[PDB]
Amino acid sequence: PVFVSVYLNRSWLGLRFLRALRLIQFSE
């Protein structure tokens, strides 16, 4: 655990919410 929240958190500002928005919306 704490492996997705850390990757979906830094991605929010790491890629203007693009690096995470593609990982949180891909699962559907």
Phi-psi region of 25 (alpha: psi -120 to 50; beta: other; left: phi over 0): alpha
Cα separation of 28 and 13, whole Å?
A: 22
* Domains contained in the chain, number: 1
Method by which this entry was solved: NMR
Q: Residue 11 belongs to what domain range?
A: 1-28
Token duo for residue 1: 């655990």
Cα separation of 14 and 28, whole Å?
A: 22
- Cα R_g (the chain), whole angstroms: 8
Token duo for residue 17: 């919410």
Tell me the CA distances in angstroms from 24 to 5, 13, 17, one per residue in order.
Answer: 10, 15, 10
Cα separation of 13 and 18, whole Å?
A: 9
Tell me the CA distances in angstroms from 19 to 15, 23, one per residue in order.
Answer: 5, 7
Cα separation of 20 and 22, whole Å?
A: 5
What is the SS3 assignment for 7? helix
